[PDB]
Design a protein around this ligand. Structure first.
Ligand code: K
Ligand code: MG
Ligand code: MG
Ligand code: MG
Ligand code: MG
Ligand code: MG
Ligand code: MG
Ligand code: MG
Ligand code: MG
Ligand code: MG
Ligand code: MG
Ligand code: MG
Ligand code: MG
Ligand code: MG
Ligand code: MG
Ligand code: MG
Ligand code: MG
Ligand code: MG
Ligand code: MG
Ligand code: MG
Ligand code: MG
Ligand code: MG
Ligand code: MG
Ligand code: MG
Ligand code: MG
Ligand code: MG
Ligand code: MG
Ligand code: MG
Ligand code: ZN
Lengths: 155, 24, 206, 127, 60, 80, 98, 118
RNA sequence: CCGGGCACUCUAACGGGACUGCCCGCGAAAGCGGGAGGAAGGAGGGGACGACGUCUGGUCAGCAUGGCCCUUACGGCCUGGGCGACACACGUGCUACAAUGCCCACUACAAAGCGAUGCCACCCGGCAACGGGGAGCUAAUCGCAAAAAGGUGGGCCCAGUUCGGAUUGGGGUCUGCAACCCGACCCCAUGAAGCCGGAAUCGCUAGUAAUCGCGGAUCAGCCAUGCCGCGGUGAAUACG
């Protein structure tokens, strides 16, 4: 977007919990445009969150998403002819996007048989501070702040 | 997938009928 | 690679079909071939009279061919025998045994096909092409014709390099649908090659 | 006695007839959960009622046809909104902020030549 | 469009399969629309000239 | 996995020729441009020169060759 | 009880002729049931613009066939007085059945 | 168990396990289990010795199987080659026999890709 | 379905409707930001439309055409072969490498088109391609027809396999005078490479991408996975 500022799309609220973050996670799970299958996967995963954890799955989901959000990342920049890894903060929308994308990607990396079990286990582990998505967050916050010397290339 | 003759989706893709896709 | 035909661009509004008749899918091609043969034999005989348009209508084995000619005295002949011979050839080619009508064109310098034909005759007589186009556009503009344009294609003046002489004046809004622009195309067969003559005449707005 | 709403979404129509009653919905003679319930967004079609919190004041007879069942759900939403507006105009100021009376004009875009599906340009390599 | 091939029109093609269709105006062999009997080029030309009743530019 | 139809097709050009040869003997090479015809049992033992597009190849027919076409034993293209 | 199917390429000529038939049958017949749209039959044609390769323009055209369904009731013998030969249209085809 | 040759399927559905027979796909497995009156859902380790004898009795001699099948295919191709047929030539050079193009892929008939200069 | 009626849906002609008109802020103005009302606003969305000219761009092989050249052959007819040749290389695509999947059964919604030496309901034979019989349809009224993903139930349980159908053997159907070179389709058997792809590189900003099926033109048939259209489900992201 060069001319305008590219305003953000407003998502419809969730049909169960009434949260737009849940709908965004549904969309990140969605594949080939199958909304019903993605919602089936996510709601069965919510059914798995209970009877495994006494807490309501909405709280677990939100706390896991909060645990996956990275505070700083690192972008490449061409300076003086070379390419440097410059660390800089992250806007909240990009925090949410990276959190949900990493949740889905790390969920599909699990050895669990069907999807709902994968999403449920990944959400639980990310809520209690482990899993592949938290590993991704830690790796990003390592790369960034591992190149602190380039912080004056913030831009 | 859609390239197997002896499947439903195969007959639908090739646009034919047979033992693996009857006409009721 | 641009500038589509204006008549074909306005066939919906401010322009009508030369052939206007209904036919099924089993009869459309035959009646179309018949109309094409009609126009072919017509333009091979009435060119001396300067025919600008040939309209064709069909109801049921009857064709209301109407020829718009600037000089009907040539298509009529002496006492009306020329039209008799032409209707005879019509009934011989197509056994439909139909009639024929002639319409005089007032101010032939407002019908673009006749303007293009005049410029083509001039170019074929080894006339100054620039002066030909200039005088043609002047004659068109000097009688109504809120807009005018005449274009002549390559080999201008028998040159070895193909050129394009523009010589236009007035208002020719081709992109305006309601422009009601009469378009005419003519060829000039010379000893050195072929000359293409296009004529645009703009009249009326709505 | 009866309040009517048309609604439309993505080449789909759904006549909505609101007749005060128990609160059970019928669609094309079938039950609301026998046509739906296998589509998650189905309950969204009943959002207008929850907007006014009636949910038990009106029975619904709906006749839907055209497009797919999701556009049918959204058209049912708009039809219920229109019938509810015809019931009491004072409901308009309650339904306008939620955009339920807003007709969703998103239609499938026409496929164009040169492309694959109306925008997907064919891949090239140049080498 | 060679003149010899215009022998296509034949009451005795010696076979039903050997009978193909050509453009009546320019003598084309490929892209010969059956509804009009013309080719595609003559189709576009006569459509622009307005000699095809009812034919209009499509836009939707 | 091939098939043509019931009522196998054989070109009647050489169909009469081979039986006219069998009627009096086992006459020598025949020249045939019809490679579309099918081999019938009454041809076994003869020798047919099939036109491959350039020349006539002397195809000798045996018992195990019945059912195929003449063109299958007359390769048209040349390679290496 | 007389079936009438009007077919044409121009939506103006068919409409004008149908209204003419309706006005000619009202004064001499019963309460005419008016014309019915009878959805249009559209046939398209896609043709490459240039005479050579240039595959990605295609400038397609269309040809539409519109219909009308007058269908007058009470075929009175006085109705055909004003009818069956009084017409302006040319590019309109008429179909009549019992 | 041991059915129609030296091949023994084990620990899966009887029809899918019979697919591992050379002369038997899924259609012939369904046909055998249908004419033998055997539930295809049961596992091989759950088969009655009488049911194994029955399936063996049917399948052993109802169609041509492993050894005779491979030998008959070899004999068919050998006959196509010995008669000098065009298909025999295509088999002789290792090229597509069913009228495919060879300027491009059909690698699966020509084996690996032997690149040369150009 | 019958009586029955034009309210709704639809169908196709006309017309209304949106113009920064109204409110607030800014501004010299044009206009910008926001809001109300509205079905929709700040170009509402998509086409048609593409200037003076440039590339001595492409095509005399669609047609026309100057010049040149062949005219017992550089013209013409026919049979057959060839344009389908394969040590190889690239482009564009299709099908996949699977469990957000595959298979089986049952079941539910679409638009745009096509149809008389045509589409073929339905009955019978056939595992099937299909054949025999045969109803309707000059077609908003009959047919193509089944939409598919989807839903429900069941099977498969991570393995080159109930993933994937290349190759090949055998038996057939139809078109056509004729399927060897060189057709599609059906049935049985065969079961390949392929576990998300190096350097590099492509498309797309909303009903778009992705995915799913449907039709059409040319055509006796068809190598269509192409092309042009149609609708179903329906995202992600734009700091700059
Ligand atoms: K040039
Ligand atoms: Mg990851
Ligand atoms: Mg398979
Ligand atoms: Mg689409
Ligand atoms: Mg010529
Ligand atoms: Mg042909
Ligand atoms: Mg047979
Ligand atoms: Mg363009
Ligand atoms: Mg096997
Ligand atoms: Mg080949
Ligand atoms: Mg009315
Ligand atoms: Mg209305
Ligand atoms: Mg414009
Ligand atoms: Mg050049
Ligand atoms: Mg060149
Ligand atoms: Mg070629
Ligand atoms: Mg080679
Ligand atoms: Mg060599
Ligand atoms: Mg290349
Ligand atoms: Mg049966
Ligand atoms: Mg009806
Ligand atoms: Mg299931
Ligand atoms: Mg397998
Ligand atoms: Mg391998
Ligand atoms: Mg695997
Ligand atoms: Mg854009
Ligand atoms: Mg076809
Ligand atoms: Mg197709
Ligand atoms: Zn032509």
């Amino acid at each position: 977007a060069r001319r305008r500022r590219a305003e953000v799309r407003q998502l419809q609220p969730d049909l169960v919990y009434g949260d737009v973050l849940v709908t965004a996670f549904i969309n990140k799970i969605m594949r080939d445009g199958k909304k019903n299958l993605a919602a089936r996967i996510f709601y069965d995963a919510c059914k798995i969150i209970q009877e495994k954890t006494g807490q309501e799955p909405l709280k677990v989901f939100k706390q896991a998403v909060e645990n996956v959000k990275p505070r700083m990342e690192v972008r490449s920049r061409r300076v003086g002819g070379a390419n440097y890894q410059v660390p800089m903060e992250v806007s909240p929308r990009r925090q949410q996007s990276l959190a949900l994308r990493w949740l889905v990607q790390a969920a599909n990396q699990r050895p669990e048989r069907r999807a709902a079990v994968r999403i449920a286990h990944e959400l639980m582990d990310a809520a209690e501070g482990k899993g592949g998505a938290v590993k991704k967050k830690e790796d990003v916050e390592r790369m960034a702040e591992a190149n602190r010397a380039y912080a004056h290339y913030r831009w | 997938g859609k390239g197997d003759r002896r499947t439903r989706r195969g007959k639908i893709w090739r646009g034919t009928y047979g033992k693996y896709r009857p006409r009721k | 690679g641009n500038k589509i035909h204006p008549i074909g661009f306005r066939l919906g509004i401010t322009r009508d079909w030369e052939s206007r008749w209904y036919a099924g899918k089993k009869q459309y091609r035959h009646l179309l071939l018949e109309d094409q043969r009609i126009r072919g034999l017509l333009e091979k005989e009435l060119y001396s009279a300067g025919l600008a348009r040939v309209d064709i209508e069909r109801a049921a084995d009857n064709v209301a061919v109407t020829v718009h000619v600037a000089k009907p005295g040539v298509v009529i002949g002496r006492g009306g025998e020329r039209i008799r011979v032409l209707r005879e050839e019509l009934a011989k080619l197509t056994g439909k045994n139909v009639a024929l009508n002639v319409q005089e064109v007032q101010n032939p310098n407002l019908s673009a096909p006749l303007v293009a034909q005049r410029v083509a005759e001039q170019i074929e007589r080894r006339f100054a092409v620039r002066r030909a186009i200039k005088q043609a556009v002047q004659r068109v503009m000097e009688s109504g014709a809120k807009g005018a344009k005449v274009i002549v294609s390559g080999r201008i003046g028998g040159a070895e390099q193909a050129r394009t002489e523009w010589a236009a004046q007035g208002r020719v809004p081709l992109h305006t649908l309601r422009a009601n622009i009469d378009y005419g195309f003519a060829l000039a067969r010379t000893t050195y090659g072929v000359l293409g003559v296009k004529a645009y005449i703009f009249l009326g707005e709505v | 006695e009866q309040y009517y709403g048309t609604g439309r979404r993505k080449e789909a129509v759904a006549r909505v007839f609101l007749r005060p009653g128990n609160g059970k919905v019928t669609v094309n003679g079938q039950d609301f959960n026998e046509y739906f319930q296998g589509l998650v967004r189905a309950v969204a079609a009943l959002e207008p009622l929850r907007a006014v919190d009636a949910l038990g004041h009106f029975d619904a007879y709906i006749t839907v046809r055209g497009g797919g069942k999701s556009g049918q759900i959204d058209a049912i939403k708009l039809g219920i909104a229109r019938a509810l507006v015809q019931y009491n105009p004072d409901y308009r100021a309650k339904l306008k902020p939620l955009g339920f009376l807003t007709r969703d004009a998103r239609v499938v875009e026409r496929k164009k030549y040169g492309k694959h599906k109306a925008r997907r340009a064919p891949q090239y390599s140049k080498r | 469009a060679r003149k010899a091939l215009i022998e296509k029109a034949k009451r005795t093609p010696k076979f039903k399969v050997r009978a193909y269709t050509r453009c009546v105006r320019c003598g084309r062999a490929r892209s010969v629309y059956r509804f009009f009997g013309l080719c595609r080029i003559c189709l576009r030309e006569l459509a622009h000239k307005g000699q095809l009743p009812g034919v209009r530019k499509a836009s939707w | 996995p091939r098939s043509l139809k019931k009522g196998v097709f054989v070109d009647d050009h050489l169909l009469e020729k081979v039986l006219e040869l069998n009627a009096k003997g086992e006459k020598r090479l025949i020249k045939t441009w019809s490679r579309r015809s099918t081999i019938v049992p009454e041809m076994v033992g003869h020798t047919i020169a099939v036109y491959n597009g350039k020349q006539h190849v002397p195809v000798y027919i045996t018992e195990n060759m019945v059912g195929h076409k003449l063109g299958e034993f007359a390769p048209t293209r040349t390679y290496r | 009880k007389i079936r009438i199917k009007l077919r044409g390429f121009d939506h103006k000529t068919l409409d004008a002729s149908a209204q003419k038939i309706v006005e000619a049958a009202r004064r001499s017949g019963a309460q005419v049931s008016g014309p019915i749209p009878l959805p249009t039959r559209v046939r398209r044609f896609t043709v490459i613009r240039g005479p050579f390769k240039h595959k990605d323009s295609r400038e397609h055209f269309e040809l539409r066939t519109h219909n009308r369904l007058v269908d007058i009731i009470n075929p009175n013998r006085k109705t055909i007085e004003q009818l069956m030969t009084l017409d302006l249209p040319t590019g309109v085809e008429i179909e009549i059945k019992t | 168990a041991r059915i129609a040759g030296v091949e023994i399927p084990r620990n899966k559905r009887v029809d899918v396990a019979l697919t591992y027979i050379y002369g038997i796909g899924k259609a012939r497995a369904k046909e055998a289990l249908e004419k033998t009156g055997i539930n295809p859902a049961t596992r091989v380790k759950d088969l009655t010795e009488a049911e194994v004898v029955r399936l063996r009795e049917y399948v052993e001699n109802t169609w041509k199987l492993e050894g005779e099948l491979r030998a008959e295919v070899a004999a068919n191709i050998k006959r196509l080659m010995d008669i000098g047929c065009y298909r025999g030539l295509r088999h002789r050079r290792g090229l597509p026999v069913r009228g495919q193009r060879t300027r491009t892929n059909a690698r699966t008939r020509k084996g690996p890709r032997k690149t040369v200069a150009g």
